[PDB]
From a paper:
Although first discovered as a placental antigen present in the circulation during human pregnancy, the metzincin metalloproteinase PAPP-A (pregnancy-associated plasma protein-A, pappalysin-1, EC 3.4.24.79) is ubiquitously expressed in human tissues.
We have determined the structure of the metalloproteinase, PAPP-A, in complex with its endogenous inhibitor, STC2, to a resolution of 3.1 Å. Some regions, in particular some of the SCR domains (4–7 Å) and M5-M6 (5–8 Å), were determined to a lower resolution, and will benefit from further structural analysis. (3) C120 of STC2, which is required for the function of STC2 in vivo, connects specifically to C732 of the M2 domain of PAPP-A, thus preventing dissociation of the complex. While the core of the CD is similar in structure to other metzincins, in particular the two known unicellular pappalysin structures, the PAPP-A CD stands out in several regards, most notable by the inserted LNR modules. The pappalysin S1′ specificity pocket has a conserved aspartate in its bottom (D641 of PAPP-A)13,39 to accommodate the basic side chain of the substrate residue on the C-terminal side of the scissile bond, the P1′ position. Thus, the C612-C643 disulfide bond, which connects the ZnM loop (V573-F635) underneath the active site cleft to the CD core, may be important for keeping D641 in a position to provide specificity.
Residue numbers in the entry:
A (entry chain P): 44 to 210
B (entry chain C): 94 to 1014
C (entry chain Q): 1282 to 1412, 1476 to 1617
The structure:
Amino acid sequence: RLSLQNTAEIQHCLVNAGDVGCGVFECFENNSCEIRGLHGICMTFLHNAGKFDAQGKSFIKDALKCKAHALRHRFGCISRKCPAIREMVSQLQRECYLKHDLCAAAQENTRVIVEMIHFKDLLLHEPYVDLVNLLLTCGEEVKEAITHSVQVQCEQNWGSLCSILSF
Amino acid sequence: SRALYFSGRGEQLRLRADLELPRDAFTLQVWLRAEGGQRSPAVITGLYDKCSYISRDRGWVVGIHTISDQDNKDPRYFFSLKTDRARQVTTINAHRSYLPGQWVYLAATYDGQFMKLYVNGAQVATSGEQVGGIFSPLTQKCKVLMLGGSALNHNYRGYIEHFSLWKVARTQREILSDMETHGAHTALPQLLLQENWDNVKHAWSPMKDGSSPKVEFSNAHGFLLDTSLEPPLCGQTLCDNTEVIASYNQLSSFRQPKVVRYRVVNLYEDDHKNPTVTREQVDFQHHQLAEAFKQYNISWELDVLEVSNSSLRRRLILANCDISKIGDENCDPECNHTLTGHDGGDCRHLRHPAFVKKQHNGVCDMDCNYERFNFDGGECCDPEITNVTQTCFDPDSPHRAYLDVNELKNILKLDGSTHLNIFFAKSSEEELAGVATWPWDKEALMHLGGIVLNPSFYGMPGHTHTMIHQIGHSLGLYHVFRGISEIQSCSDPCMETEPSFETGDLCNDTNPAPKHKSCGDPGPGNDTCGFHSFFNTPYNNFMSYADDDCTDSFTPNQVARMHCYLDLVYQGWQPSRKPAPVALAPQVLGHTTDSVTLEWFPPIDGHFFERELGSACHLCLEGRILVQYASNASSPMPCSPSGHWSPREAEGHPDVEQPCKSSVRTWSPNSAVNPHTVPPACPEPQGCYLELEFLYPLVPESLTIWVTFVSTDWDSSGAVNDIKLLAVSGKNISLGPQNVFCDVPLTIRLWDVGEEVYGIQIYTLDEHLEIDAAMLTSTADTPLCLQCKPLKYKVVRDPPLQMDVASILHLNRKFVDMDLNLGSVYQYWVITISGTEESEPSPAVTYIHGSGYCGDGIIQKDQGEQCDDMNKINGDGCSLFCRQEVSFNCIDEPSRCYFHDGDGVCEEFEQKTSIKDCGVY
Amino acid sequence: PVDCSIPDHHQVYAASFSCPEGTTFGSQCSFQCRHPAQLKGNNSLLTCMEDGLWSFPEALCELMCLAPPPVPNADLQTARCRENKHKVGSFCKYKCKPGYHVPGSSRKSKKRAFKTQCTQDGSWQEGACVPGQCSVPNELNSNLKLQCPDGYAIGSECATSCLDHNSESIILPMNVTVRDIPHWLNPTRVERVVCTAGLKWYPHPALIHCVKGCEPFMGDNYCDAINNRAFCNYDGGDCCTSTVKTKKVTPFPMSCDLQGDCACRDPQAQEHS
Ligand SMILES: *[C@@H]1O[C@H](CO)[C@@H](O)[C@H](O)[C@H]1NC(C)=O
Ligand SMILES: *[C@@H]1O[C@H](CO)[C@@H](O)[C@H](O)[C@H]1NC(C)=O
Ligand SMILES: *[C@@H]1O[C@H](CO)[C@@H](O)[C@H](O)[C@H]1NC(C)=O
Ligand SMILES: *[C@@H]1O[C@H](CO)[C@@H](O)[C@H](O)[C@H]1NC(C)=O
Ligand SMILES: *[C@@H]1O[C@H](CO)[C@@H](O)[C@H](O)[C@H]1NC(C)=O
Ligand SMILES: *[C@@H]1O[C@H](CO)[C@@H](O)[C@H](O)[C@H]1NC(C)=O
Ligand SMILES: *[C@@H]1O[C@H](CO)[C@@H](O)[C@H](O)[C@H]1NC(C)=O
Ligand SMILES: *[C@@H]1O[C@H](CO)[C@@H](O)[C@H](O)[C@H]1NC(C)=O
Ligand SMILES: [Ca+2]
Ligand SMILES: [Ca+2]
Ligand SMILES: [Ca+2]
Ligand SMILES: [Ca+2]
Ligand SMILES: [Ca+2]
Ligand SMILES: [Ca+2]
Ligand SMILES: [Ca+2]
Ligand SMILES: [Ca+2]
Ligand SMILES: [Zn+2]
């Protein structure tokens, strides 16, 4: 259900916005298919990139580049219907992060990734959900760390409801 | 006489410093044939200062640049000048966008207080801002006169012939005299330069980089009796012209009986049962058609076509519906229908979440057959599970239950060039029963054109005059309520305020009427604008929306339109082999003490050669040059390996109503995709390409491409990255990037191509560029046009020619009468002989030898001459028929016409209309 | 009366105008050619004419270059250049004296001759003519390591390595320590050390400190502060707009100040020109 005018403006965005940084993700936001969070992933990663180590700075150099470039191409003749777009974005996350070894970089900066991930931001944006899911299969120690943080944040924000859902 | 061709790639000339350039006053005079798609700006010639390190704008420049610089759209001739003493540069322009491929006498003068620009001798611009001399004698060595472009690569592409430069300003009579000499050479004291290009190196040295333009033999300076007759503002073809249509109106010999064949497409089941229309329908409708058309000299020959195809018969044929609009989640009532899934579900909402269980069931039911449920995943479109003809509602499955008439027309591939095809559909609208192709479309004679009707409204008592309405549409008749209900707005420039030949339905005898269904006179307040009430409306005319019980007649002007279009376009339908007549009376060129010269127009259909079936000569023009449009068209399917595809909108003659606006009648890379799919970007630097093939491969001479729309942003590549000529032997000559204008057809000359070219490939990096059509013009005496015989004209005079002339026949459309007596009245008409069958006589011209006429240079006001310029060319202000053109005022005798709407001087008759000069009234 | 207005530089180029009588019809403003432009003609008065535009000048301020200055250690080759009459664009050839060569000449071909041009402002374009064993390195930096495959014999070369693989062993100027490095200073890279005949290491290990080498992020369109220094290509031109390929500056991380460390520090940028 991607609006035709919305599609036109996004298409003109991509050919103009540069690869580096996240000018690309900027106006892929506000899309008619409600897909939000790519630009948030950019800002979260870029702001917290100062806390990453040498390997982490490499990962942020090249994973953001993969997603920018791939969203400039996979947004080719993909179906105008929303479910196809959500799948295209999801596959961007999986392929870009896995190709660039998300697991080991996250293992080097577990304490950082825990700070970056927010329970609130997790619910608002689907790309965040794919990010945390890929982290869960990136080492038992890291997955344990993520579980600790997510339950405490959910418990504070939801009160007894979080404990009810956390069987 | 020789002419320079500037290829636009860097060939420039520079006048040698031996000549004393003019300081105080000057006059440039150059014949030129500019091509389409120039670089903006394109300096034809200019005076430049080579010493001014800071202000290069000093000096003057004559060239072609776009008015409305934002979205370069309107390329006009221009004259810029900045004297050494002035503060700003001053630019004046022509009245209209230049015409590519036409010889134009561009003359520009400056007398020291008034700079003026003349196009074909009619003063089109004037400015008094620049005062004083151009440059002081001290700076005389610092001025260089350069032709073909500036040193800044403001290059010009096209022909330049007989450059001339005076050191005085020439009044309009002097420039007109110099134009009529047509390159004749003579030395005058005020002549600095006169160039016949016999020796370019003698006077002009090429600019640096050593690229000099080529020197051809000029085909001609011009042609007497300009035969180019443009239709009016509303009109579309030569039959909308007031002069042409007057001949069909006044004369009764132009409406002789004509038999026109029409074919009825009757679909059938495989067992030859269940007709789409019963034989009673065809017989009854044919009888009613014959009765209505009997009195108007049109009789229809009935051919019935039985197609026994259940796979076509059982499906629902749709009219006015577009398959792309089904399932787009936007409600489309015209594609509503039971077998289309109510627009594929766009127009049918319900408690959808209550149907999740029915998914994955493996059996078709009803609720899952929609686009948001994805049509049950193809269970319903499977012939094995269920029954497609009532279950396969999807617009993508080839087994869908509905077609549209465009696909039905594609399937049948009927010969539309010899019959009027009557297809049958299901018109959902209560307004019309179908769509009839206009005579001025591509498909008028192709397999995709004809008439689509509703079988429920065909041959039924009370519904028979819907086919006669549609037939009138297919013969060029507009709706009588055009101009009020079919106008764009109340400010439409040719809305029919009063009965006229140039507004509305282009039929005077049909009063303005609104879109009204009852055949009483419309009531007060039934007007969209409400400016005037309607009286004596043609409520009973076939072209009105009244019921079949009251519509009974065509007005005599509408009958004239139908017969004009039966000679212009539909010569193929009629079995009669009478060639089309000459529409206009033989014009009088000039008279001597003992003779008179007559030149007449070609026959109205426009063909100069005898019509032979199967030959290519119906495309040949005078001089045996073959001009053809893109027949094939193919362009790779985007984001698909191979894909092939076939963009039929870029075939045939150009059909875009309004250039520079996005249209559906073009090839656009974005249009190549499924509308339910994000359009890709054109591949990097090769571009999306459109292949156009031409029916008759031949040695090309010039290529014309109608680039209707261009996105406005990038550079000067013109969005046409490359053009390749597919040679027959297998080569492919690349022509390099071309500059295009959105409203001027990109013209290219192919003098370098020596091999037979069968097609082109228009590459583009633009995802929004739109190509309307192409055109190949052959060289003179092309092989295919040699054998076919030419049309021959026979001239008949009243009184008859004294010697027993057999008319000696004719081929040149020029007759010199030697036998004349002073003061005697003579009448002339021409009869077109195509083999041995003579056409109807052309309208007569009455020339009284020794007296005046139209085109003698004397304004005989009694004859009706509003102007007279001793000349038979339109566009010089005074029309061919001795009538002032719009926005041109003509003074003196013979007439000197000038463009007054913005000549820098307000006048008496300009006060009420011209705000540019006289201000707000 | 019609106003010709104060005459601008457009009436006569490279001159100043005095208008004692004003700028009205019939006025006459006298022009003087500014140095070094020389007046050529017989009148220098511009009349304000009836059309509203200053009259034509009867004379012009010709631009010219006087005798070029004698370039040190160079001999003029063009005799005509010895005059005091050279128009704009005139070339003068100089030949360096023996034992001298033009700076910027390649080693394979030392050009002993050059040319200069009379530039538009009346000056001349510049041109010149340019003519046992060794002690164990006990005093070493913690991050610095020395590898000696050939022992410590006089003349043996020991490789200087750093604990950080992205750190370079260098020697800074005496006025600049490890943390005192300015943006404009490019330290001397040191790779090997040689013990001389004086029983001493040269350069001394105590003078070598492992300074953080820049990360491989050079030339990735990401202006990062660490690589933004003269030691390595100012982050490969990422931090300066003209040098970067994308023509836009996106500092990494975002928090880096565009007016601070991530500011364009390369002095060869067009913004610095
Ligand atoms: C029909 O044709 C006859 C000649 O056969 C002519 O006299 C008459 O004017 C024509 N009428 C119309 C309406 O075309
Ligand atoms: C009928 O036309 C269709 C095209 O729509 C074609 O596939 C088929 O072979 C034709 N004949 C029959 C008997 O269906
Ligand atoms: C389609 O037809 C159905 C049934 O006639 C109707 O309810 C629906 O409004 C129609 N869709 C349109 C008008 O687009
Ligand atoms: C499809 O329709 C035909 C009509 O004759 C009928 O014979 C056949 O049984 C139907 N098949 C299904 C699966 O409905
Ligand atoms: C046009 O029609 C009007 C009546 O509406 C009539 O008076 C006039 O003579 C007609 N003129 C022509 C040229 O047919
Ligand atoms: C049209 O051109 C395409 C591509 O060159 C070709 O495959 C096809 O056969 C052509 N068709 C005709 C009718 O010439
Ligand atoms: C065009 O010509 C070039 C050689 O100039 C050749 O490589 C190419 O295959 C030809 N065809 C096209 C479509 O480019
Ligand atoms: C130049 O000016 C002088 C006065 O200063 C006058 O005597 C002489 O005639 C002038 N010469 C020319 C060539 O005008
Ligand atoms: Ca729809
Ligand atoms: Ca179903
Ligand atoms: Ca009318
Ligand atoms: Ca077209
Ligand atoms: Ca006359
Ligand atoms: Ca004329
Ligand atoms: Ca005027
Ligand atoms: Ca960097
Ligand atoms: Zn109609």
